[PDB]
Design an enzyme around this catalytic site. Structure first.
Site, PDB file in Angstrom:
ATOM      1  N   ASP A  94       0.789  -1.215   0.000  1.00  0.00           N
ATOM      2  CA  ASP A  94       0.000   0.000   0.000  1.00  0.00           C
ATOM      3  C   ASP A  94       0.838   1.290   0.000  1.00  0.00           C
ATOM      4  OD1 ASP A  94      -2.809   1.174   1.976  1.00  0.00           O
ATOM      5  OD2 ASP A  94      -1.894   2.106   0.291  1.00  0.00           O
ATOM      6  N   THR A  95       1.023   1.827  -1.212  1.00  0.00           N
ATOM      7  CA  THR A  95       1.765   3.023  -1.391  1.00  0.00           C
ATOM      8  C   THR A  95       1.122   4.272  -0.777  1.00  0.00           C
ATOM      9  OG1 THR A  95       0.765   3.438  -3.605  1.00  0.00           O
ATOM     10  CG2 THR A  95       2.832   2.178  -3.496  1.00  0.00           C
ATOM     11  N   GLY A  96      -0.159   4.209  -0.493  1.00  0.00           N
ATOM     12  CA  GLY A  96      -0.858   5.310   0.166  1.00  0.00           C
ATOM     13  C   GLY A  96      -0.779   5.299   1.674  1.00  0.00           C
TER      14      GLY A  96
HETATM   15  C1  LIG Z   1      -1.023   4.300   7.346  1.00  0.00           C
HETATM   16  C2  LIG Z   1      -2.529   4.223   7.085  1.00  0.00           C
HETATM   17  C3  LIG Z   1      -2.973   2.779   7.044  1.00  0.00           C
HETATM   18  C4  LIG Z   1      -3.250   5.027   8.163  1.00  0.00           C
HETATM   19  O1  LIG Z   1      -2.763   4.805   5.812  1.00  0.00           O
HETATM   20  C5  LIG Z   1      -4.006   4.818   5.026  1.00  0.00           C
HETATM   21  O2  LIG Z   1      -5.095   4.457   5.459  1.00  0.00           O
HETATM   22  N1  LIG Z   1      -3.893   5.253   3.796  1.00  0.00           N
HETATM   23  C6  LIG Z   1      -5.034   5.355   2.875  1.00  0.00           C
HETATM   24  C7  LIG Z   1      -4.742   6.584   2.021  1.00  0.00           C
HETATM   25  C8  LIG Z   1      -4.591   7.837   2.883  1.00  0.00           C
HETATM   26  C9  LIG Z   1      -3.347   8.391   3.046  1.00  0.00           C
HETATM   27  C10 LIG Z   1      -3.143   9.509   3.851  1.00  0.00           C
HETATM   28  C11 LIG Z   1      -4.229  10.097   4.498  1.00  0.00           C
HETATM   29  C12 LIG Z   1      -5.480   9.553   4.318  1.00  0.00           C
HETATM   30  C13 LIG Z   1      -5.681   8.419   3.532  1.00  0.00           C
HETATM   31  C14 LIG Z   1      -5.176   4.067   2.040  1.00  0.00           C
HETATM   32  O3  LIG Z   1      -4.002   3.694   1.305  1.00  0.00           O
HETATM   33  C15 LIG Z   1      -5.532   2.897   2.950  1.00  0.00           C
HETATM   34  C16 LIG Z   1      -6.230   1.879   2.074  1.00  0.00           C
HETATM   35  C17 LIG Z   1      -5.887   0.525   2.623  1.00  0.00           C
HETATM   36  C18 LIG Z   1      -7.026   0.084   3.436  1.00  0.00           C
HETATM   37  C19 LIG Z   1      -7.921  -0.779   2.844  1.00  0.00           C
HETATM   38  C20 LIG Z   1      -9.024  -1.221   3.551  1.00  0.00           C
HETATM   39  C21 LIG Z   1      -9.200  -0.795   4.837  1.00  0.00           C
HETATM   40  C22 LIG Z   1      -8.312   0.107   5.434  1.00  0.00           C
HETATM   41  C23 LIG Z   1      -7.191   0.561   4.734  1.00  0.00           C
HETATM   42  C24 LIG Z   1      -7.693   2.251   1.952  1.00  0.00           C
HETATM   43  O4  LIG Z   1      -8.266   3.000   2.755  1.00  0.00           O
HETATM   44  N2  LIG Z   1      -8.311   1.776   0.879  1.00  0.00           N
HETATM   45  C25 LIG Z   1      -9.693   2.083   0.604  1.00  0.00           C
HETATM   46  C26 LIG Z   1      -9.514   3.426  -0.113  1.00  0.00           C
HETATM   47  C27 LIG Z   1     -10.798   4.152  -0.549  1.00  0.00           C
HETATM   48  C28 LIG Z   1     -11.315   3.580  -1.844  1.00  0.00           C
HETATM   49  N3  LIG Z   1     -12.628   3.405  -1.924  1.00  0.00           N
HETATM   50  O5  LIG Z   1     -10.549   3.309  -2.762  1.00  0.00           O
HETATM   51  C29 LIG Z   1     -10.352   1.030  -0.257  1.00  0.00           C
HETATM   52  O6  LIG Z   1      -9.723   0.363  -1.092  1.00  0.00           O
HETATM   53  N4  LIG Z   1     -11.656   0.852   0.037  1.00  0.00           N
HETATM   54  C30 LIG Z   1     -12.558  -0.014  -0.754  1.00  0.00           C
HETATM   55  C31 LIG Z   1     -12.714  -1.420  -0.190  1.00  0.00           C
HETATM   56  C32 LIG Z   1     -13.308  -1.500   1.175  1.00  0.00           C
HETATM   57  C33 LIG Z   1     -14.694  -1.634   1.353  1.00  0.00           C
HETATM   58  C34 LIG Z   1     -15.176  -1.704   2.643  1.00  0.00           C
HETATM   59  C35 LIG Z   1     -14.309  -1.646   3.729  1.00  0.00           C
HETATM   60  C36 LIG Z   1     -12.951  -1.507   3.542  1.00  0.00           C
HETATM   61  C37 LIG Z   1     -12.450  -1.468   2.254  1.00  0.00           C
HETATM   62  C38 LIG Z   1     -13.900   0.670  -0.857  1.00  0.00           C
HETATM   63  N5  LIG Z   1     -14.526   0.767  -2.052  1.00  0.00           N
HETATM   64  O7  LIG Z   1     -14.333   1.142   0.157  1.00  0.00           O
END
Ligand SMILES: CC(C)(C)OC(=O)N[C@@H](Cc1ccccc1)C(=O)C[C@@H](Cc1ccccc1)C(=O)N[C@@H](CCC(N)=O)C(=O)N[C@@H](Cc1ccccc1)C(N)=O
Lengths: 99, 99
Positions: free
Chosen positions: A25-27
């Protein structure tokens, strides 16, 4: 390896003698794993993302293996929805983004 | 280009004729931008991150440039902490992870 992004970039990590699936996870600034035991001292920390913040425990200097690549770094442990390998550890295994 | 991960992989994007900074985020399924105005109909979506779920507006077939690479795709808009370029668009521009 070269990993495409048609699907989530999930990989096998090895940590504390356990094997687990985690998201490259690059984010993510940090590496965060679901609740588990790790050795040593730790301090509390709040980490935030979409949805707000959660409370985690920070363990420093933890050995980890990501697809065969060995590294050491800080690992946070708490109620994360999925295991995340963040930039602190991606750098160590030589992981870059390319396009 | 090749982007290392020692700092956040922030890039310049262009959308609606305006330049914005956004995070290349392999851990994000979708692209989510901070509150802004986009043309056309939108549909609802709930998306989940580290601290829970938030409500966002989905716009389809939106023109967006990422580091000058032209893309046309789905863009979500809501109360995200930072502009995030997710896998839906990272795939369009031919982005992979490599180590
Ligand atoms: C270090 C720390 C873990 C805290 O960093 C982040 O959370 N960074 C953020 C990006 C971010 C960076 C800086 C500030 C804010 C956000 C992301 O890279 C995290 C990632 C990894 C993650 C995945 C699932 C659950 C939690 C985390 C993240 O939030 N992904 C999300 C991003 C939003 C999106 N719809 O694309 C994601 O893929 N969500 C998907 C899948 C999902 C569904 C339900 C429940 C959980 C996941 C979605 N459609 O919601």
């Amino acid at each position: 390896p070269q990993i495409t992004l048609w699907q989530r970039p999930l990989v096998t990590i090895k940590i504390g003698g356990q094997l687990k699936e985690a998201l490259l996870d690059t984010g993510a600034d940090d590496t965060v794993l679901e609740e588990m035991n790790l050795p040593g001292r730790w301090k509390p920390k709040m980490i935030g993302g979409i949805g707000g913040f959660i409370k985690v425990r920070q363990y420093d200097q933890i050995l980890i293996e990501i697809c065969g690549h060995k590294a050491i770094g800080t690992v946070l442990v708490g109620p994360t929805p999925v295991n995340i390998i963040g930039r602190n550890l991606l750098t160590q295994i030589g992981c870059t983004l390319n396009f």
